[PDB]
């Protein structure tokens, strides 16, 4: 036959902190901070291969590139302030807004707006393109939402069905003229199809800050206060999941490149990452200030968060067989761990020395515990433990002090403590350090026993309250 490596005992942990999502969501480097004046209302990426992002703040819309602390471009000819800079699907034109009410089309290489729309009477805060790249949908604070044509330079259509400030609009990439709008009047109405009235309406319990469309399945996600609600369009107005994991208002809601991941930023310096399949939290992000804007690049390459204050955070990441020949496979050599090689040649003391290496004890105590268990199984633990001076036994005592209290490692380490106590009794008086280590182990023993007695009392009480029901 062949030699068999020692079994490494695995102990399950209640927490699920170690996750593949955790690895995929923590790969990123250190955040970089960019200073700005005024609150960052939103940040929008462009889908073209030169991925850049537009940050709107106060009266200035800045275009930043990857890295590039200074803006690569700036639009500053806004009379008081700008709102909702958004890119087109071709990355060549951008829609903007202002407190005057004129909707402005800008070229990403120019200085003055190409087209101005003057229909609105008060401040406008949401503007977006359609599925076709030649119409725009805009919503302002005068309780109305308007559809405009870009080449014709005139308003196509107007809707007036809202009772408060209208400040969040979204459109569908799949279907033109199918768009969804959001206001502070607690309602979200879907002005769509080819009709002069809303086909569907949705009621939210708080003012609606953000709405987003999942491209596949007809799922609409809306944020109001702490609540984030998911509504299905297969059957009208069907609230699938309502979730709250923030202790303040949820400001912004973004979708990852993969459909399964959903990111929600809020006002309490925390961003939650959820899986859409389970609708449960899978990751958390913590920031220095409240997240007003959250933006994602192609794949999940760059994360951009814009705060209440000016600064915003950017987070980057020989010969081969011919067909007619007959194939013969050679065996691949299997590599044994060093302790396995020692145990194969019966170097029990050397194996115990290897597993007592401080790097091994810190990173993987389970390997050391498994090797002690194997030595106990072979019945040669006493031989390996005996015959050592004060220095060698002191490290074993340190490991026992650090690891005896652990419930997973308790029996075998208790047995090892028994063995070392039996062997090293006559030589105790010489060394003070071993005395100190034994005293520490002793004290940990009494405190663990007191802990377990308290546990027994609580066990009896829980037995009562269980048997009541």
């Amino acid at each position: 036959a062949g030699y068999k490596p020692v079994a490494i005992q695995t102990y399950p942990i209640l927490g699920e902190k170690i996750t593949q999502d955790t690895l995929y969501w923590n790969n990123y480097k250190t955040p970089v901070q960019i200073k700005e004046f005024g609150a960052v209302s939103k940040v929008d990426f462009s889908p073209q291969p030169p991925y850049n992002y537009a940050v709107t703040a106060s009266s200035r819309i800045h275009i930043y590139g990857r890295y590039s602390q200074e803006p690569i471009k700036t639009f500053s000819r806004f009379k008081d302030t700008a709102y909702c800079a958004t890119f087109r699907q071709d990355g060549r034109l951008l829609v903007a807004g202002s407190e005057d009410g004129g909707v402005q089309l800008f070229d990403i290489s120019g200085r003055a707006p190409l087209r101005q729309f003057e229909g609105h009477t008060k401040a406008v805060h949401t503007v977006d393109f359609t599925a076709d790249k030649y119409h725009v949908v805009s919503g302002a604070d005068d309780y109305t939402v308007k559809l405009w044509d870009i080449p014709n330079s005139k308003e196509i259509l107007t809707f007036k069905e809202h009772s408060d400030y209208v400040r969040c609009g979204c459109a569908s990439k799949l279907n033109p003229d199918l768009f969804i709008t959001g206001s502070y009047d607690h309602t979200v109405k879907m002005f769509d199809a080819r009709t002069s009235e809303s086909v569907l309406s949705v009621e939210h319990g708080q003012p609606v800050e953000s709405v987003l469309l999942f491209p596949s399945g007809g799922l609409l996600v809306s944020a109001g206060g702490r609540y984030v609600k998911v509504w299905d369009m297969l059957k009208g107005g069907q609230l699938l999941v309502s979730l709250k994991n923030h202790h303040k208002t949820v400001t912004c809601l973004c979708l990852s490149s993969s459909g399964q991941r959903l990111l929600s930023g809020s006002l309490d310096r925390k961003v939650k990452v959820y899986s859409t399949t389970s609708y449960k939290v899978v990751h958390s992000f913590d920031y220095a200030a409240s997240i007003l804007s959250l933006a994602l690049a192609h794949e999940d390459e760059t994360i951009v968060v814009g705060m209440t204050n000016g600064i915003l955070s950017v987070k980057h990441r020989n010969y081969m067989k011919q067909r007619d020949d007959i194939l013969i496979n050679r065996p691949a050599k299997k590599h044994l761990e060093l302790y396995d090689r020692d145990l194969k040649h019966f170097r029990i003391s050397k194996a115990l020395d290897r597993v007592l290496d401080p790097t091994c004890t810190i990173k993987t105590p389970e390997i050391t515990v498994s090797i002690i268990k194997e030595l106990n199984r072979r019945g040669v633990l006493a031989n390996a433990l005996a015959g050592r001076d004060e220095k060698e036994i002191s490290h074993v005592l340190n490991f026992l002090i650090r690891n005896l209290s652990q419930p997973r490692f308790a029996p075998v380490l208790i047995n090892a403590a028994e063995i070392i106590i039996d062997i090293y009794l006559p030589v105790i008086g010489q060394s003070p350090v071993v005395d100190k280590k034994f005293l520490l182990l002793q004290g940990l023993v009494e405190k663990e026993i007191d802990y377990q007695r308290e546990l027994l009392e609580t066990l009896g009480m829980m037995d009562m309250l269980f048997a009541t029901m």
């Binding site: 067989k321 011919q322 020949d325 013969i328 050679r330």
Partner: protein, 253 residues
């Protein structure tokens, strides 16, 4: 192409090369049809040869311990990875006796290892002073000719591992190849300068400084390959360091 050889009893030619395949071909002047081709995983063939009986094929690789034996009659491919009593790390250079009862492996520290052909178990070891450059078996298979790295050639007895004689090749700083004729009349040694010395076999056995019959100066770069005609009328010499460096020698003249 590392090795090419004709089958002793059938019109079969075997071609092996740095590509891991070993192939056997029907020897026809027009087409040369393929019989079978076998590809090993990570085994670039350093040398492949037929057995003396011709029933099995033996192959070895560059810096590989395992020796592959392919028994055609039984259809079994036996990889000989472990040879008991052998301390050699890698096996690349080896020779087979004409009678088929012995196999010789060139080792390190000037060691020659003799193995039984049928069971692949070590018989004994012979140590020479200096490196082993090349080795060959006698026509009667009763003696071993080994050329050292300082230009000296040793003669060993197969049955009792004793050094019969030690002679010196003329004007050789170090040898690269050695060959013997089937009839037992000629012994040929190649050296670094491209000079091939041809001796009578009786001269090598009894003289410490033999005088070659004729020294071939036609080749100018170090001779690596020596092959005798079965009728002992043609000697083929070659050097791999230059292009077009192959010659043919008429033995009696």
């Amino acid at each position: 192409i590392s090795s090419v050889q004709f089958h002793p009893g059938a019109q079969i030619v075997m071609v092996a090369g740095l590509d891991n395949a070993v192939s056997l071909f029907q020897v026809d002047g027009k087409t040369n049809p393929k019989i079978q081709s076998i590809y090993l995983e990570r085994f670039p063939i350093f040398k492949a040869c037929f057995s003396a009986n011709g029933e099995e094929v033996l192959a070895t690789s560059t810096h590989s311990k395992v020796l592959y034996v392919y028994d055609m009659l039984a259809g079994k491919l036996i990889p000989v990875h472990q040879v008991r009593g052998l301390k050699e790390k890698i096996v690349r250079s080896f020779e087979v006796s004409p009678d088929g009862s012995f196999l010789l492996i060139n080792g390190i520290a000037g060691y020659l290892h003799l193995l039984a052909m049928k069971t692949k178990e070590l018989i004994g070891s012979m140590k020479i002073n200096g490196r082993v450059a090349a080795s060959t078996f006698s026509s009667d298979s009763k003696k071993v000719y080994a050329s050292s790295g300082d230009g000296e050639v040793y003669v060993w007895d197969v049955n009792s591992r004793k050094c019969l004689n030690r002679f010196v090749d003329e004007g050789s700083l170090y040898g690269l190849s050695i060959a013997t004729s089937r009839n037992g009349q000629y012994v040929a040694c190649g050296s670094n300068c491209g000079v091939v010395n041809i001796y009578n076999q009786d001269s090598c056995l009894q003289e410490t400084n033999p005088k070659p019959i004729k020294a071939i100066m036609n080749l100018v770069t170090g001779v690596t390959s020596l092959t005798f005609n079965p009728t002992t009328e043609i000697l083929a010499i070659a050097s791999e360091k230059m292009k077009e460096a192959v010659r043919l020698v008429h033995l009696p003249s």
